[PDB]
Design an enzyme around this catalytic site. Structure first.
Site, short mmCIF file in Angstrom:
data_model
loop_
_atom_site.label_atom_id
_atom_site.label_comp_id
_atom_site.label_asym_id
_atom_site.label_seq_id
_atom_site.Cartn_x
_atom_site.Cartn_y
_atom_site.Cartn_z
N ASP A 35 34.87 40.02 42.21
CA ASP A 35 33.64 39.83 43.00
C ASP A 35 33.36 38.35 43.16
O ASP A 35 32.80 37.72 42.24
CB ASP A 35 32.49 40.52 42.27
CG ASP A 35 31.19 40.40 43.05
OD1 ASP A 35 31.23 39.98 44.20
OD2 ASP A 35 30.14 40.74 42.45
N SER A 199 29.94 29.44 59.35
CA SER A 199 30.78 29.81 60.48
C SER A 199 30.29 29.10 61.75
O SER A 199 29.07 28.87 61.90
CB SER A 199 30.74 31.34 60.66
OG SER A 199 31.36 31.78 61.81
#
Ligand SMILES: OCc1cnc(N2CCOCC2)s1
Ligand code: NA
Length: 330
Positions: A35, A199
Site C-alpha cells: 500500500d 498530473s
C-alpha cells in the site's frame, strides 16, 4: 541488494493485489497488500481476536526465533474506506522477494474491522508511503522500504500491476525490459506523507487533451481512480445511460456499454487507461448496472491515482533525497 516479488489480484475485478512476504525464523509466509498510501506493516496474528479471523494466515511471533516484543509500542490505523486495525508491535526479520530487512517493525493486530475479517485473501498490509505516517506510538517506526533503502543498489521501488493478471514489485532496480518508451519523472511533495504529485491533464477517449493541474497521490492500496467531479462528469457523459447513483455510492453504467479510454498527463507524457480497465462489473450479482472505475474524489479531500490508473503504467517510486515518481507505458 535488490528484491523482486510477484503481486497477484485477489479476485476477478483486481480489487487489490497480494504479494507473499516472509516474516520470522523459520519463515512464516503471509500474503500482504502493498500500500503506497500508508506506512504500517501490520499482520493478522496469534493475538488477533479469534472471531475477527476467517481464513487469513496468521503470524505467530512465539514461533519465530528472531521475534522480539517492541515493549510498550502500540498502533492504530484508520483507512480512507472506513476500515481499521490496531494492536502491539514486534521486531522481526522480513523478506520480500529476496530482499531481507532485520529489525523490521511487524505490527501484530489485536483487532481488525469487518472489511478485513471478510477478506480471507489479505493477511495484512505492507505500507510504502513515507514513514512520517507510521502510527506506532510512542516511537514511530520505519517502513520496510525506508529500512531497506541504504542496502539497495538504487533507492527505488517499482510497481508493475497487471490487468486481470499478476504483476511485479521490484526493490532497488528499474527493470528496463518491463516498459516501453521512456520513463517520465515528476515532482513529489512529501508534505502529507504520500507519494503526492501533479498530473498535467486528461483526455476522454479520442477527445482533445485538457491541460489542467490535478494534484493527487499514487496509491496502490486504493482500487479505483478518484478525480475531481468536473473530470469525472466529463468522462461518464461519454457513456450513454451512465449516472451518479447516491443509492449505489458512485457512477454506474449499463453493462451493455463499451467504455472509452481515459488518458492522464505526466509532464508532457500521456498514460492511457483502456476502457476495459474502468469496468468493475455488476453492482450486485446478476445486475445489468455496472460499477465505474473512475469516481469523484469530492467527498475524500484528495485525488487518488489508485490501481485503475497505476496498472496502465510502469511506476517508479524514487526514494532518493529528493523523491520523484516516474511513469512509463508498458
Ligand atoms: O445522478 C446524478 C448525476 C450526476 N451527473 C450525472 N451524469 C450523467 C451522465 O453524464 C455525466 C453526468 S447523473
Ligand atoms: Na465496491
Amino acid at each position: 541488494s535488490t528484491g523482486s516479488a510477484t503481486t497477484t489480484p485477489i479476485d476477478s475485478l483486481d480489487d487489490a493485489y497480494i504479494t507473499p512476504v516472509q516474516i520470522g525464523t523459520p519463515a512464516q509466509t503471509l500474503n500482504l497488500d502493498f500500500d503506497t498510501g500508508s506506512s504500517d506493516l501490520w499482520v493478522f496474528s496469534s493475538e488477533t481476536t479469534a472471531s475477527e479471523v476467517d481464513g487469513q494466515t496468521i503470524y505467530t511471533p512465539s514461533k519465530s526465533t528472531t521475534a522480539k516484543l517492541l515493549s510498550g509500542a502500540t498502533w492504530s490505523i484508520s483507512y480512507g474506506d472506513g476500515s481499521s486495525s490496531s494492536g502491539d508491535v514486534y521486531t522481526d526479520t522480513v523478506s520480500v522477494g529476496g530482499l531481507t530487512v532485520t529489525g523490521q517493525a511487524v505490527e501484530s493486530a489485536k483487532k481488525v474491522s469487518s472489511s478485513f475479517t471478510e477478506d480471507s485473501t489479505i493477511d495484512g498490509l505492507l505500507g510504502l508511503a513515507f514513514s512520517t505516517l507510521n502510527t506506532v506510538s510512542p516511537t514511530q517506526q520505519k517502513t520496510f522500504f525506508d529500512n531497506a533503502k541504504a542496502s539497495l543498489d538504487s533507492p527505488v521501488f517499482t510497481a508493475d500491476l497487471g490487468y486481470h493478471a499478476p504483476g511485479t514489485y521490484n526493490f532497488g532496480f528499474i527493470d528496463t525490459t518491463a516498459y516501453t518508451g521512456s520513463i517520465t519523472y515528476t515532482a513529489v511533495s512529501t508534505k502529507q506523507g504520500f507519494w503526492e504529485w501533479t498530473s498535467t491533464g486528461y483526455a476522454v477517449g479520442s477527445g482533445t487533451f485538457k491541460s489542467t493541474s490535478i494534484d493527487g497521490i499514487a496509491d496502490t492500496g486504493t482500487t479505483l481512480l478518484y478525480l475531481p467531479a468536473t473530470v469525472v462528469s466529463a468522462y461518464w457523459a461519454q457513456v450513454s445511460g451512465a449516472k451518479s447513483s447516491s443509492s449505489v455510492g458512485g457512477y454506474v453504467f449499463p453493462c451493455s456499454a463499451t467504455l472509452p479510454s481515459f488518458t492522464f498527463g505526466v509532464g508532457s507524457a500521456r498514460i492511457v487507461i483502456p476502457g476495459d480497465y474502468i469496468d468493475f462489473g455488476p453492482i450486485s450479482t446478476g445486475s445489468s448496472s455496472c460499477f465505474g472505475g473512475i469516481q469523484s474524489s469530492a467527498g475524500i479531500g484528495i485525488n487518488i491515482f489508485g490501481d485503475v490508473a497505476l496498472k496502465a503504467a510502469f511506476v517508479v517510486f524514487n526514494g532518493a533525497t529528493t523523491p520523484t515518481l516516474g511513469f512509463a507505458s508498458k
